[PDB]
Amino acid sequence: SSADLTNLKELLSLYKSLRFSDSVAIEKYNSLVEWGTSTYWKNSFQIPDEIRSACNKVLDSDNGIDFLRFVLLNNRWIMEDAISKYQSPVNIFKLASEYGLNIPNYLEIEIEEDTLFDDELYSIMERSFDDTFPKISISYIKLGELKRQVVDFFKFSFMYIESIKVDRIGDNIFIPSVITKSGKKILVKDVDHLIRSKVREHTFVKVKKKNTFSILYDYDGNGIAGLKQLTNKLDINECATVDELVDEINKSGTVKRKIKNQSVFDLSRECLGYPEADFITLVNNMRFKIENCKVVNFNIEYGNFNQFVSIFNTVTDVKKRLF
Amino acid sequence: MDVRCINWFESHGENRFLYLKSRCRNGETVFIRFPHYFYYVVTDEIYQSLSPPPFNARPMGKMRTIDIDETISYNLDIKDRKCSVADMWLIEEPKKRSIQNATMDEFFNISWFYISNGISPDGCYSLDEQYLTKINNGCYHCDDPRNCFAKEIPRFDIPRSYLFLDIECHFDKKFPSVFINPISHTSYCYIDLSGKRLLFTLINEEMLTEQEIQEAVDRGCLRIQSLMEMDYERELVLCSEIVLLRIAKQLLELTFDYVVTFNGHNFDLRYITNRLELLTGEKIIFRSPDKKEAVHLCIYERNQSSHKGVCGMANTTFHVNNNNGTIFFDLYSFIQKSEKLDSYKLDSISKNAFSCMGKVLNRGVREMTFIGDDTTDAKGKADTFAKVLTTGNYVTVDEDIICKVIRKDILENGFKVVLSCPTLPNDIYKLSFGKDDIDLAQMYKDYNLNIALDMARYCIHDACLCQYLWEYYGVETKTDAGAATYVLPQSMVFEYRASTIIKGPLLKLLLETKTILVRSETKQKFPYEGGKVFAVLIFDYNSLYPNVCIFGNLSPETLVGVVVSTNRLEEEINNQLLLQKYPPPRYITVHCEPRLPNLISEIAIFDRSIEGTIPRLLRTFLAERARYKKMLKQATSSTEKAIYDSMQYTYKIVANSVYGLMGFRNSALYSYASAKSCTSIGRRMILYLESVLNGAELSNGMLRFANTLSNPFYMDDRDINPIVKTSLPIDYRFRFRSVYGDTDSVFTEIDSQDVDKSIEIAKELERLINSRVLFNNFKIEFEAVYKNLIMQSKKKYTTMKYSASSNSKSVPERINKGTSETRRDVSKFHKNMIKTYKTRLSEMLSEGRMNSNQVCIDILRSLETDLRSEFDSRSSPLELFMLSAYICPANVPSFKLGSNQRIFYEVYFKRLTSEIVNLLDNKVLCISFFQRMFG
Amino acid sequence: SVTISHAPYTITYHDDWEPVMSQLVEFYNEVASWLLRDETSPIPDKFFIQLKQPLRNKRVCVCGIDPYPKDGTGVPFESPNFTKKSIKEIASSISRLTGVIDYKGYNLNIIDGVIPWNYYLSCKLGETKSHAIYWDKISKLLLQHITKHVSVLYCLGKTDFSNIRAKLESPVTTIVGYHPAARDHQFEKDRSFEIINVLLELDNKTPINWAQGFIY
């Protein structure tokens, strides 16, 4: 029937583009693989709706494209290129600009004969890109093919970290940027290596450093709190009192709906600086002893855990008092 | 007008009908034709907004619709189930309707026809003849099965026709073909209504010279060249193949009640139909009781697996497409389905079904006389074996001794049979029936008169085996029991799985409790452990899992929620809020296993204030099986002793089938929580018993139980005190060591190792470990495995060595119950020495004091000298292997051997000593002996 | 061209039928005597003409069940005068993908890629499904060999094809269908067509051009 044709065409479509698919997409992928075998025997952050309309319009401006490569870096939905089988980058960029999106600019010296990228052809490229955005990207576009083989420049070395803290990314929002040994605050791109990755201070860690910016380097073989850092972590005010906190939450209309739909372990690990990744791997490593929904004892069997318990009791208490 | 119902069947044509075959009091058969509808359960508003109006709609009252989708929850704020209460109606549609948001869609229209009309499928009724108009002789029409089947009378007895048949075919390949090979013989067991049991075998003329045909007519036989020329009173008949096939067709078209045969759907009936088509160009015409529809015999398959992977094997069962009411039965399919035997040949099936014992009377050269009586051997076995001997020819003594009878005498009680077997010393011998060592392939290359008649006997016995086995398995009463417990026709009783039989009881239930379970959400699977393996007294649980789903009140509709916790420190908060909220004993919180990571809790909460549908089902089943066990204990007639036995067995089978039906995704009782729950409650109970069963007993009245009798799942104030006070003699010493068990057993290691001292102490312990240590409905029972019955592996890896209830002057037996080493297609040379190696293997496990040194030096010296003695002497004959050919190099350290005697046993010789290590307590001698056995 | 005993005394085939053709000889020899006991349709001279068609350049089998009792031709669904029952029906119901309506003939034997296949290679003229007993073995064998060289199977039949997976000892993409021999042709509710196309992509085969078979 046509109803079956729907999910069959969907199976084919999604099978063509697994590389850019979502979690529910691969879900439908395997579910339809099974629905076919049993009948015939054989990512990024959120993009706005005012941006979703423009993106749907730009996907149709040249139907050779499959997805919209939106670089989600530092709470910024900045794209570096639109992969469209025939559409040039500048045209889609002008369309996005007429829509109000972040398109980059290109500043480089081009040569009529292709030379192999090396020390010069990467260092001078990073220094000449002239883009005031945080990225190690060295960008280029060649006429005749749409493939992307990007280049960059850095050197891997060792340094002792300073702490597990944050740098002010936006208005009353301090996004974690573990400051480098010389003093600079590293530019963390993806939430993988940006939440608390290697929170260890003074630890001799190997990273890919450059003169000004850098990136984190993962291993090859073996592998600071208070009420203040809660009020700005959901952006109501600055505070040092629980009554002030709950009253400001009452004054809000959507913040209460935000708290209502979050757990307290989440909210207390998110406003503390290490939400899940290795946290639970340690909180399972510890025996616990609680009372009245308030942790009072723990035993190992990271560093922000004592203060974490101290703010966790606080968020539990304010949630109880508000709800 | 009184009738008793024999079978229900539906007409497969343009018109949908439902027929009732029934026998009146005086033995006359009457058919009744009911219009067959489609049935839809629809709420009141849907019914009022129906276009076009339904054909017929009868009210159903206020039913509560319950949404039973299980939604996991990460905090303890769980929304209660969505439960509506609406006025329902039952829509009866002649032609199928597509009606939206109608519920109770999982129940067949035949179940509805029974339930809505109040009709049991096997009952005996006094039909109000005021409605049954007559359409033709023997067929009535019933438009109103409500007021016609009102008055229900008690069960009376009726006569029943039969036909047990078998054929044999010429061949030189492994199996004949309808085109090249003609059928030689064709036997029958025609049992008329009046009771006339007529046996007769038709023989093929065209394989005989005219000289031997005349010799046979002179000897004793009849000769026919027409159809109206034969009579079933003659026991042997000679004819061509055309008249043989025309007689077969004339029989199969008769309205017998049953037509039984063993694997006669795939081979016998198919061969007959095909060959009749080839020879005469005719077919077997099954006409409907109203004479308004005729089909031709044509066998069709029915794959049975409720889940089929890629490149597997599903038990395709062949069925006849008849539409006259006769239940064309096939014992082969029924036996494969119902019981899981070792093999499924007719020979072995008989050899394990018809047994008896025979005491030697007078030996002699190449002969031996056996007597089998009721007063000497197990009552009933001699009578059935003497019922089988009336036609059999080749009797089998205890093992590998197949003897052609010489003369048989059927006394008023027992039997006396002379056998052509060489002389045997022992006075007693167990006689089983049937292996029939004959070279049919060779017997066909020299076909003449004597061989024709020998094969006619061989075939009439095989046609009567399908009657002796049909009475042994009580199929005629199991059918009428299943057709009343599961509200189904007598023909559809053994054709389906559990998920189909369970829908009659369930639908009858949901119209008392007035519930309607719905699922507006899909289900997800989480694979699990489908089978347990593991390795003294034996106490078992009284149907553990129904008792658990009744204790915990497990069900899909009595689930409050599955409170799950991602990682630690949330499981603890949730545990404390589950201790305060949802408190015992109205709620039970069971720690199921996590369904997916990362998760560590998956606690399920069941409300124990209303009886769910599943626990009420199980309680009704247990109650009825108990009632029927009681009524069978007091039965006086030999017919009621069968009816009630069948009813009890039926309730047992339908009760034991529910636990597996909860973890089955596409089932009317699916609930992932309850399935995963009763598996955890039962396991907790088993481990609880094992915890308190390792306790010593001394200075009678101690039995310390090794631990406090702490009730799991909650405290209950039940006099928690390990030391109990028993009622057995005073001075004792026995401790019970560790107990292991699987789910229906807990074997405790008694430190006595002798009968008459365990049976009593265990029978008094089981009364004290199910009235003082178990809580609500967890009863126990007792048996005994005498002198270390070999525990090789999980359940079906043991010997019999039976000691059930008596141990004083009692008679145990130690043949086998393994069903693991009895099958051929293997070697024949070195193994079967177990028959000589068991007397020293069963004796190395039955000492206790000198057992250790004896067993270790015995295995070592025995196996090393067996290797050397087979390599040097070349002694062992070629008889059998008996384990469920192969070639291997012997130059380095049809089944015939070679020049070096270490060809192909160097693997079985170590697999055997690997199987038998878990019956001792030595950890140094056993494993080191095993390691050194390699060199 | 193997020489059988009875008619047609020899069976000329294509070079891609030898993996089977040997045992087909005995399968046909044990049944021929009763097979030609009556004049069938197709005649005994064109029983295995479809054994001339290669299987390398084909990926779809529109399996019928039995040839047209009124003089089928040995190639399934074919029509020397385009005046039959089911073939014009399927040509009509397929005239919508290609969008054209002008045809003087439509045989599936010229659609490059598809092979019309008769399950029972014969039938008694006037009767249907009347030679099933004679064909069962060879029919199952020929189908099993047709599916081991191609991968798609469109059984044009509602209940005639119900246990097809059982009679096939290897997994092959067994699409099913609904016999348009019934009333209303039952082809409108289910869009059986173009499902073959979608299924011919998951291993990158080319879609069937159902226009390739008309006559122009």
Side-chain angles (χ1 to χ4, degrees), chain B residues 632-701:
Chain B
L632 164 90
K633 198 182 310 160
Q634 79 179 39
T636 190
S637 155
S638 202
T639 90
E640 317 303 275
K641 276 195 66 71
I643 290 179
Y644 300 150
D645 197 316
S646 85
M647 272 285 197
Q648 153 251 291
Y649 149 93
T650 282
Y651 274 104
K652 191 247 300 185
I653 288 312
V654 83
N656 293 348
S657 92
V658 151
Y659 161 62
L661 228 63
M662 279 182 309
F664 181 57
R665 215 174 155 211
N666 289 276
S667 161
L669 312 175
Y670 178 67
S671 64
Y672 176 73
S674 322
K676 284 246 307 188
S677 213
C678 95
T679 303
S680 194
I681 293 175
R683 167 174 330 179
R684 187 76 207 79
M685 191 79 38
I686 286 284
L687 180 46
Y688 161 57
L689 207 46
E690 304 182 24
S691 80
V692 298
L693 251 184
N694 309 10
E697 172 215 330
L698 182 139
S699 303
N700 152 92

Side-chain angles (χ1 to χ4, degrees), chain B residues 748-785 787-788 790-806 808-847:
Chain B
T748 136
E749 300 183 43
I750 171 70
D751 198 281
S752 176
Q753 317 292 9
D754 86 308
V755 308
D756 316 326
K757 198 49 106 169
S758 87
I759 291 267
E760 159 72 335
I761 201 186
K763 261 185 320 187
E764 214 273 342
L765 201 80
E766 82 111 286
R767 191 258 306 174
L768 202 41
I769 70 175
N770 82 329
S771 94
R772 274 288 317 244
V773 82
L774 269 313
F775 341 119
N776 265 346
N777 40 328
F778 295 117
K779 269 65 166 74
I780 216 155
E781 275 192 330
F782 144 86
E783 290 83 14
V785 282
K787 292 331 205 87
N788 271 261
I790 329 296
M791 205 70 216
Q792 194 206 82
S793 314
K794 78 157 308 183
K795 289 312 290 286
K796 49 204 174 42
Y797 286 94
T798 59
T799 169
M800 61 165 295
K801 191 31 94 195
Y802 255 86
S803 62
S805 298
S806 159
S808 44
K809 321 282 180 104
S810 198
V811 43
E813 213 68 22
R814 203 200 202 121
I815 296 314
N816 195 6
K817 331 172 300 283
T819 308
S820 51
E821 56 261 340
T822 192
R823 264 97 60 155
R824 293 198 60 157
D825 212 319
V826 199
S827 146
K828 75 176 323 193
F829 197 70
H830 213 33
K831 213 143 163 193
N832 87 345
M833 67 183 210
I834 45 187
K835 278 80 193 174
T836 35
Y837 201 74
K838 283 176 321 185
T839 190
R840 50 200 69 112
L841 176 85
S842 324
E843 175 54 14
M844 55 168 57
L845 284 174
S846 88
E847 286 324 282

